Design a protein around this ligand. Structure first.
Ligand SMILES: COc1ccc(N2Cc3cnc(NCC4CC4)nc3[C@]3(CCN(Cc4ccn[nH]4)C3)C2=O)cc1
Ligand SMILES: COc1ccc(N2Cc3cnc(NCC4CC4)nc3[C@]3(CCN(Cc4ccn[nH]4)C3)C2=O)cc1
Ligand SMILES: C[S@@+](CC[C@H](N)C(=O)[O-])C[C@H]1O[C@@H](n2cnc3c(N)ncnc32)[C@H](O)[C@@H]1O
Ligand SMILES: C[S@@+](CC[C@H](N)C(=O)[O-])C[C@H]1O[C@@H](n2cnc3c(N)ncnc32)[C@H](O)[C@@H]1O
Ligand SMILES: [Cl-]
Ligand SMILES: [Cl-]
Ligand SMILES: [Cl-]
Ligand SMILES: [Cl-]
Lengths: 383, 383
C-alpha cells in the first residue's frame, strides 16, 4: 500500500438473499397499501425461514390488501418457485401478525395535524453521503458489489447459467488514492462471490463462470490485475440457500441499502415504512441534500447528519462535513442547506413524492445511486 | 456554531425496547447453549409482537435447552410481568422455528477443521473504533444516551418512579471542539427521552421527573445550560409500549450496539451468534485493536476495517485510519497490528474467551465501553 492510498471493502446481496427477501416483501406490502390509500400508516416487518413468511407489525390503512397474494407474488418475482430451490411461493406458509398502529403513537405524530406539520414518526439520527468518484455519486466498492449480484440474477433469468439460484452475496475491496479530500479508485484488490446453485453443477464450472461471465462482464479490466484475489464459491458448496439456509428479517441489510460502510449510518431500516417514519424519509432527504451539494459543485464528497424527536416536525439539528472538498465553510454549507431544503417529514413527502408506491423497487441493489428516484435528482441550489 | 466546533447525535434504547428485548433473548439462548456445549453453532433470531416471542434460525448443539424457560426468564428480568404493562413473561406465546445449521455452511466453515483454522462463518466487513474523549474510549453522545436508559431502569426497579415501564429511548446531541484530530465535548445541545408509563401519571409529573431525577442524575451540570433543548415525553403519551406498540427483531439496534453513528458499521448484527460468526467476533476484535491502539498511546482516535470470505480463516485485508492523531503512519500502524493480533476467528475465540456464556450481558447498553469484557482490556503492544 503506497502512502496516500488505502483499501476499502463493501458488500451487497442478491434478490433472493433471505434478509433482502424480507425487505422486498415489506415494501411490496407498503406499495399495496399505498396503491389504495396514499396516507396508509405502515410498519411492516417480514421474517423468513424454511417454508415461512411471517408479517409482523402495525398498519392503519383504508386499503383492503390480500397479504397472501402480495407476499406470494413478491416471492415469485424473486424466483423461488419450486421445492427443489428450497422455497416456493406457491406452497409456502404466509402468516400474518399485523395490528393497527398504536393510538398513542398516532395521537403524538399525526392525528389532527396539518400535513406539513406532522411530527417525526420516531426519534432517531440519519446520515446522507455522496462522493463524486462515480457519476451516480456512490462508492465504487458498493456499486460494483451490487452490479455483481444483478449480473447473477440476469444470467439466472436469461437461462445462461441455469444452475444459479436467487440467493447470492458479493464483496469488493478497492484500493483508492487520496485526492484533496475526494477519493480516486485505483484497482480491485479482492472479490468474493457466493451464490446458491443446483445439485448437479460442479465447483470448477461455477468458478470459471463466475470469473468469465460475471466478474469480467461487470468490473472494468483496468481495475483487475495479476494480483487481484478471487474468492469464488469459497464455501465449496451452496445448494441449501434462501430462508432454508439462513433466517431473514427486514432491516438486516442497512449498510447494503446505503453506503457500503462509507459515510455513516444512524441505525434505522427503510423497508416496510411509510413516509412519516423518518428512518426512511429523512435518510432519503439527506441523500438528496448530499447529492445536491456534490452535483451543484459545492463539494466533491460530503456527509450530512440530521436527527428528530418523535412528535416534533423540524429536525433537532443538521450538520455538514465536506471532507476538505469545499471552499465554503461548514457554516456556509449549512446556511445553503437551510435556505434550499425543508426537512420536516410533511414537506419531504411532497418534495420526494413519498406516497407513490415505488418502494419495492428500492428494496434490492441499494436505495441510492440508481434509477433517478426523486432523491437522486439534485435540487438546483440558490445562494 | 463556532468554527472548529460541530454537533453530533447518538441514541440508545432501554432493556424493554422491543428490538432490544429480541437481542437479549437471542443472547439468552446463545448463553444457554454455551453453558452445556461451548462449541454450539448458534444463529438465533428473535421476533417480538403483542403476546409473542418467536425464535427463528439455526442451531446445532449438544445442549438440551428449554426454550420456554430461557425466553420467559429473559422477559421477566426485563420487567414485562403483567398484562397491565402490555407484555407478560408468564402468559405470552413462545413459538420456535429452529433447525440445524445448514450442512453446506457447516462443511465449508468448520467441519474437519483445526479450531485455529476454522473459516469465517460468513463473508462481511466490520469496523472497530475508539476515541479518547472518555476514559472508556467511547463517544460521549452514546455513553450519555445509554446511561439515561440505565437510570430509567434503575429508578423503575428501585420503586422511585413506579409509573415507569421497561420500554424507553433516549437521544443526545453534543457540541464538540476539534483537537488535532481528536474531539473534545463542549456542551449538551439537545436531549430526547421517551419512556413507556402507566395510565395514571400525568405529563407534567413525568417531564419534571425526567429532568430532575434522570437527566440531572446522569449528565454533568457543566454540559447543560440555559440553551439546552429538552424533548421529554415529546409524543405526549406512551402507555402502549414494548412489542405491543412496535414489533421488535434481533439486530435492529446495530448502531446503538456499537458507536452511535461515529466510526463506521459493516452491517452485521451481534446477538444470537456464536464466535464463528465474524459479524460478532471480528467486530469485537476490531474494537479490541482500536482500544489497544488508543490506550497504548499510539492514537487518540482510530478506525479499523477488517473483512472476510466465508470459509477462509484470515481476514481478506485490514486497514487503519488514525484521524491525524498518530505520529506513526498508516503503514506503521498496520505493521504493529499484524505483529500483535491474529484476527482469524479460531484465534479470536481464544484471545477473547468467546465460548464463555456472557453474551446476554452484552445485549443492552452497548457491547463496547462497559464492564471490562475481554475486548475492552487493551493488549500490551510490542514494536
Ligand atoms: C487529502 O485527501 C484525503 C485524505 C484522507 C482520505 N482518507 C484516507 C483514508 C486512509 N485509510 C482508510 N482506511 C479505511 C478505514 C476504515 C478504516 N480510510 C481513509 C478514509 C476513507 C474512509 N474514511 C473513514 C470512514 C469510513 C467510513 N466513514 N468514514 C477515511 C479517508 O477519507 C481521503 C482523502
Ligand atoms: C483537526 O481536528 C479535527 C478535524 C476535524 C474533525 N471533524 C470535524 C467535523 C465537523 N463536523 C462534523 N459534523 C458531523 C457529521 C456527520 C456529518 N463532523 C466532524 C467530524 C466528526 C465526525 N466525522 C465524520 C464521521 C461520522 C461518522 N464517521 N465519520 C467527521 C470530524 O472528525 C475532528 C477533529
Ligand atoms: C452464512 S449465512 C449466516 C450464518 C448462518 N445463519 C449459520 O447458521 O451459520 C448468511 C448468508 O450467507 C449465504 N449462505 C448461505 N449458505 C451458504 C453457503 N453454504 N455458502 C456460502 N454462503 C452461504 C446466504 O446468502 C445467507 O443468507
Ligand atoms: C415510534 S415506534 C416505530 C413506529 C411504529 N412501528 C408505528 O407503527 O408507528 C419505535 C419505538 O418508539 C418507542 N415508542 C413506542 N410508542 C411510543 C409512543 N407512544 N411515544 C414515544 N415513543 C414510543 C418504542 O421504544 C418503540 O419501539
Ligand atoms: Cl447475511
Ligand atoms: Cl416503524
Ligand atoms: Cl425503534
Ligand atoms: Cl448467523
Amino acid at each position: 500500500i503506497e502512502e496516500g492510498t488505502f483499501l476499502f471493502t463493501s458488500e451487497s446481496v442478491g434478490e433472493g438473499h433471505p434478509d433482502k427477501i424480507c425487505d422486498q416483501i415489506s415494501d411490496a406490502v407498503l406499495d399495496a397499501h399505498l396503491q389504495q390509500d396514499p396516507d396508509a400508516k405502515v410498519a411492516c416487518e417480514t421474517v423468513a425461514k424454511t417454508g415461512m413468511i411471517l408479517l409482523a407489525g402495525e398498519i392503519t390503512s383504508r386499503a383492503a390488501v390480500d397479504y397472501q397474494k402480495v407476499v406470494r407474488e413478491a416471492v415469485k418475482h424473486i424466483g423461488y418457485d419450486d421445492s427443489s430451490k428450497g422455497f416456493d411461493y406457491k406452497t409456502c406458509n404466509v402468516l400474518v401478525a399485523l395490528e393497527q398502529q398504536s393510538p398513542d403513537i398516532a395521537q403524538g405524530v399525526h392525528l389532527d395535524r396539518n400535513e406539513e406539520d406532522i411530527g417525526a414518526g420516531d426519534q432517531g439520527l440519519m446520515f446522507g453521503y455522496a462522493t463524486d468518484e462515480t457519476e451516480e455519486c456512490m462508492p465504487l466498492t458498493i456499486v460494483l458489489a451490487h452490479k455483481l449480484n444483478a449480473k447473477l440474477a440476469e444470467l439466472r433469468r436469461n437461462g445462461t447459467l441455469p444452475w444459479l439460484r436467487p440467493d447470492s452475496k458479493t464483496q469488493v475491496t478497492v484500493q483508492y488514492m487520496q485526492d484533496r479530500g475526494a477519493v480516486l479508485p485505483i484497482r480491485v484488490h479482492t472479490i468474493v462471490i457466493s451464490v446458491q446453485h443446483d445439485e448437479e453443477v460442479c465447483l470448477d464450472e461455477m468458478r470459471d463462470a463466475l470469473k468469465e461471465k460475471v466478474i469480467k462482464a461487470v468490473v472494468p479490466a483496468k481495475y483487475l490485475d495479476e494480483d487481484t484475489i478471487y474468492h469464488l464459491q469459497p464455501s465449496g458448496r451452496f445448494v441449501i440457500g434462501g430462508p432454508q439456509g439462513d433466517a431473514g428479517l427486514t432491516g438486516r441489510k442497512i449498510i447494503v441499502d446505503t453506503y457500503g460502510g462509507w459515510g455513516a449510518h444512524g441505525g434505522g431500516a427503510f423497508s416496510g415504512k411509510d413516509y412519516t417514519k423518518v428512518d426512511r424519509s429523512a435518510a432519503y432527504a439527506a441523500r438528496w441534500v448530499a447529492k445536491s451539494l456534490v452535483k451543484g459543485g459545492l463539494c466533491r464528497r460530503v456527509l450530512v447528519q440530521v436527527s428528530y424527536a418523535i412528535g416534533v416536525s423540524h429536525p433537532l439539528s443538521i450538520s455538514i462535513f465536506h471532507y476538505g472538498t469545499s471552499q465554503k465553510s461548514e457554516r456556509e454549507l449549512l446556511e445553503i442547506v437551510k435556505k434550499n431544503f425543508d426537512l420536516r417529514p410533511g414537506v419531504i413527502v411532497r418534495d420526494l413524492d413519498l406516497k407513490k408506491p415505488i418502494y419495492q423497487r428500492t428494496a434490492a441493489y441499494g436505495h441510492f445511486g440508481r434509477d433517478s428516484f426523486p432523491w437522486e435528482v439534485p435540487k438546483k441550489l440558490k445562494y
